[PDB]
Design a protein around this ligand. Structure first.
Ligand code: HEM
Length: 211
């Protein structure tokens, strides 16, 4: 039975019920409240977008270099976001905003991903799944609400895909199921146990929006 379903179960229970129907956590950090209650700023959102771009650039470099050969299965999935973020940062530059340097949440996550990618493929796969699949789920609703609050409803490229998203996602889920099928139970469990750290490091990047 498909291992992605196991990763999704763990991810959902780590959401707050404010923010997702299947979430089981209480609101503890900002950002963990329902998005409609957020008070974002453009300054904070730009830090979030720059730090996000650093993480996506890092994930793209890891699957191209493929220090473990299974990572090459995840090249060119259609979910890559670095080009879309570059376009959106240029839109903000054309509007007169300053683009910030990467902040500590993105620098920290990028460094950790590079380390994991070499030493711990099971833990890396947990982050690959949670980072990309978070974005195409709640990330889209964050983008829409932030654009309503601050951008007069501008629809940024970060929230657009060149192909049907349900099919893109399902084909990556089936690739993830295939890379995990030879794993032992212990390797699968090790992957699942990494999910809290992905939520922590991602959450610190999301919190920039509200900073
Ligand atoms: C402000 C924060 C967040 C909100 C509002 C949010 C909201 C949601 C919602 C409403 C869903 C269910 C809809 C769906 O499956 O398409 C979902 C799914 C998901 N979220 Fe989040 N989420 C947040 C943060 C995170 C974080 C930090 C992670 C992990 C780093 C994450 C990982 C996932 C995953 C993996 C799914 C399953 C998506 C799928 O099955 O394709 N989310 N999220």
């Amino acid at each position: 039975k498909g291992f992605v379903e196991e990763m999704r179960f763990v991810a959902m229970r780590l959401h707050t019920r404010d923010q997702a129907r299947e979430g089981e956590k209480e609101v503890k950090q900002p950002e963990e409240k329902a998005v409609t209650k957020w008070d974002p700023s453009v300054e904070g959102y730009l830090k979030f977008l720059v730090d996000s771009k650093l993480v996506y650039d890092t994930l793209e470099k890891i699957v191209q270099e493929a220090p473990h050969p299974s990572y090459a299965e995840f090249r060119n999935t259609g979910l890559e976001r670095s080009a879309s973020l570059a376009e959106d940062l240029e839109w903000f530059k054309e509007q007169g905003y300053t683009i910030p340097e990467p902040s500590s949440p993105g620098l920290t996550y990028a460094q950790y991903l590079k380390e994991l990618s070499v030493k711990d493929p099971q833990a890396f796969i947990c982050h690959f799944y949670n980072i990309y699949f978070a974005h195409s789920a709640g990330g889209r609703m964050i983008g829409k609400k932030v654009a309503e609050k601050l951008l007069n409803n501008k629809a940024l490229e970060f929230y657009k895909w060149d192909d049907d998203l349900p099919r893109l996602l399902q084909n990556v889920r089936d690739k993830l199921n295939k890379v995990a099928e030879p794993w032992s139970r212990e390797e699968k469990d090790h992957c699942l146990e990494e999910t809290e750290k992905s939520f922590k490091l991602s959450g610190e990047i999301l919190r920039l929006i509200l900073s």
